Design a protein around this ligand. Structure first.
Ligand SMILES: Nc1nc2c(ncn2[C@@H]2O[C@H](COP(=O)(O)OP(=O)(O)O)[C@@H](O)[C@H]2O)c(=O)[nH]1
Lengths: 285, 345
């Protein structure tokens, strides 16, 4: 399945793919929409499960809302299993009072015209994104969580792992895109998410500097390498640690240093969660 | 007759009869939709007048009746509830008649014609259940005063009077009305109620006064005349001038605002009012110093603004262009007026 980033001109889609994708995501342009027959829209929209519409908060959005409503009607008449999300963008220059009023105005303007159309069965989500923050990564993570059909199993696994091991917060990141596949039931703090995102940057950059011998051997590694595991202790009685789960996944957990004295039991539960994740994501019958 | 109602009661194509909404009888329908159906799928009538005659024949034979049981009325074209076989029904449901206004068949304008052309109430009242989402535990209600008639070249007025209403729930209901009006192709905006009233009046403001835009009708006069319509009879002449002035108001997008006078008789002391399509500008024709009375709609704020209302500087540009047109800048008005003479073939 693919992810289609819709919207209008000067909405911020190219900057989103510059930040997230450039460090299946497709960017349709702000013009030549579904009324035009320049592309086979019904063939693409059948294979696409996530539709994202980017709405500028500062600019006028009523024509954007009408284009969004006719695009929602088009994709519902194509397939009933598509997920629709609304990306309210360019909120870096806005104040704290402006964002809540803009979100309330956009949600009240959209969810009543959804009832006016009559397609009340489909769920439409709303996200506050900005390319200068990490909220675009969290919004794309919540988009990606809808497409994965294995989200409640991983979420229940992370819930019982956080309850058993006294782990405050857990994420299942993808290290290439800094997008977390699953997290626990506790809310995601932005101060936790920034240091969890930069933890991957420190690990990947130091492993790119010093992981030169073997590592990227063209034929095959003669010895199987260890998984990348890291531990950082901070001064505010908190410990961050990573364990490499798969070839593209990792598990960053936030644990108090009072509870990190029994780090062997947390390591054993991380190994059991590694076995669970590698058995879930393996090909089966 | 009977087979027409049997064709109307078809479940497959039929007419869209109303559902089991609370307060409404079964087999209820809107009169406008079934008049539109009796235009198309019928035994051979075309215009609306004989469709109204057929529905009046069905009303006289008690095949259909009003949803209130008021079996004394004629068939009224518009949003009127009728069912297939008192005044408390009039205080619950909105019922707006439709004016079948004749189109301008004569290419000569109405201020240049050789001969001038020359039931339901004007205002209707319903009682509104303001709280519909049950946000408040108490009972809230307001009285709504609306126009009994609808015309496509006239503005439709809604007046709300309230005491026992929490104004947040009323603002939510008006915002839902504004969203529905934007989706339906209309524009529902708040307007001033007394925009040309004196400061001593009830609806007037002490710091508000109207601006005057003079209309230069001296340049439109011929060589040796003092009346613009001296070729016709003089007794209708000012009325012709009124129509001519209305024609210029129809060029700049002003719609006639038939305001209901609050118990005011003596119809020479109330003047016709015009409202722009954006709802930004009021316009009044006075009467002797032929021109326009210009007022701003200060009730139109940012939250009601859209693409159909323009920007915040639309009214200043409209004032500048209207002042330029009324003063005969670049011989624009003569370019209008002689073009009207080009309709006098
Ligand atoms: N300062 C700032 N600028 C932004 C933000 N989001 C988008 N922009 C700017 O808005 C422009 C939007 O372009 P875009 O719609 O993505 O181009 P398109 O994809 O080809 O239609 C970009 O060139 C950005 O420079 C933001 O959050 N902050």
């Amino acid at each position: 399945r693919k992810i289609i980033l819709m919207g209008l001109r000067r909405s911020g889609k190219s900057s989103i793919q510059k930040v997230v994708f450039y460090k299946s995501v497709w960017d349709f342009p702000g013009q030549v929409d579904v009324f035009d027959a320049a592309f086979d829209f019904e063939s693409i929209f059948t294979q696409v499960g996530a539709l994202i519409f980017v709405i500028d908060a500062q600019d006028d959005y009523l024509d954007a809302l009408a284009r969004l409503h006719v695009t929602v009607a088009r994709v519902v008449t194509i397939n009933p299993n598509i997920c629709i999300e609304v990306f309210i963008h360019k909120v870096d220059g806005l104040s704290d009072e402006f964002k809540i009023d803009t979100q309330r105005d956009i949600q009240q303007r959209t969810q009543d015209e959804l009832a006016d159309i009559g397609l009340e069965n489909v769920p439409i989500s709303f996200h506050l994104t900005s390319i200068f923050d990490h909220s675009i990564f969290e919004a794309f993570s919540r988009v990606i969580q809808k497409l994965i059909p294995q989200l409640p199993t991983l979420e229940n696994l992370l819930n019982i792992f956080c309850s058993n091991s006294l782990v405050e917060k857990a994420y299942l990141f993808d290290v290439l895109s800094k997008i977390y596949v699953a997290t626990d039931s506790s809310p995601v703090d932005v101060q936790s998410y920034e240091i969890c995102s930069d933890f991957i940057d420190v690990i990947l950059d130091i492993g790119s500097i010093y992981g030169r011998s073997s590592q990227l051997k063209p034929g095959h590694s003669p010895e199987i390498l260890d998984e990348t595991s890291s531990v950082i202790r901070l001064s505010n009685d908190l410990v961050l640690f990573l364990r490499e789960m798969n070839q593209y996944l990792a598990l960053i957990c936030i644990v108090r240093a009072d509870n990190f004295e029994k780090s062997g039991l947390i390591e054993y539960n991380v190994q059991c969660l590694q076995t669970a994740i590698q058995s879930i994501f393996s090909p089966r019958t | 007759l009977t087979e027409i109602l049997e064709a109307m009661k078809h479940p497959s194509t039929g007419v869209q009869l109303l559902s089991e909404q609370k307060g409404l009888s079964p087999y209820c329908f809107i009169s406008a939709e079934v008049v539109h159906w009796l235009v198309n799928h019928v035994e051979g009538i075309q215009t609306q007048a004989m469709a109204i005659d057929i529905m009046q024949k069905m009303l006289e034979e008690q095949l259909i009746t009003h949803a209130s049981g008021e079996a004394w009325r004629t068939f009224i074209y518009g949003f009127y509830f009728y069912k297939i076989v008192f005044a408390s029904f009039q205080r619950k449901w909105f019922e707006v008649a439709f004016v079948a206004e004749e189109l301008v068949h004569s290419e000569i304008p109405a201020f240049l014609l050789p001969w001038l052309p020359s039931t339901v109430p004007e205002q209707r009242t319903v009682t509104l259940d303001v709280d519909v989402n049950n946000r408040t535990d108490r009972l809230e209600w307001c009285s709504c005063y609306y126009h009994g008639n609808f015309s496509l070249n006239a503005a439709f007025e809604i007046k709300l009077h309230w005491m026992a209403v929490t104004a947040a729930v009323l603002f939510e209901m008006v915002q839902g009305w504004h969203r529905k009006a934007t989706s339906c192709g209309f524009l529902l905006v708040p307007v001033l109620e007394g925009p040309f009233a004196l400061p001593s009046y009830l609806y007037g403001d002490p710091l508000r006064a109207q601006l005057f835009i003079p209309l230069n009708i001296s340049c439109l006069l011929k060589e040796g005349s003092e009346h613009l319509f001296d070729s016709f009879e003089p007794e209708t002449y000012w009325d012709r001038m009124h129509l001519f002035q209305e024609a210029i108001a129809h060029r700049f997008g002003f719609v006639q605002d038939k305001y209901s006078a609050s118990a005011f008789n003596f119809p020479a002391e109330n003047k016709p009012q015009y409202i722009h399509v954006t709802g930004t500008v009021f316009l009044q024709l006075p009467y002797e110093r032929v021109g326009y009375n210009w007022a701003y709609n200060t009730m139109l704020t940012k939250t009601w603004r859209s693409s159909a209302t323009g920007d915040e500087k639309f009214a200043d540009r409209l004032l500048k262009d209207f002042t330029d047109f009324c003063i005969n800048r670049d011989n624009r008005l003569v370019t209008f007026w002689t073009s009207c003479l080009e309709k006098m073939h």
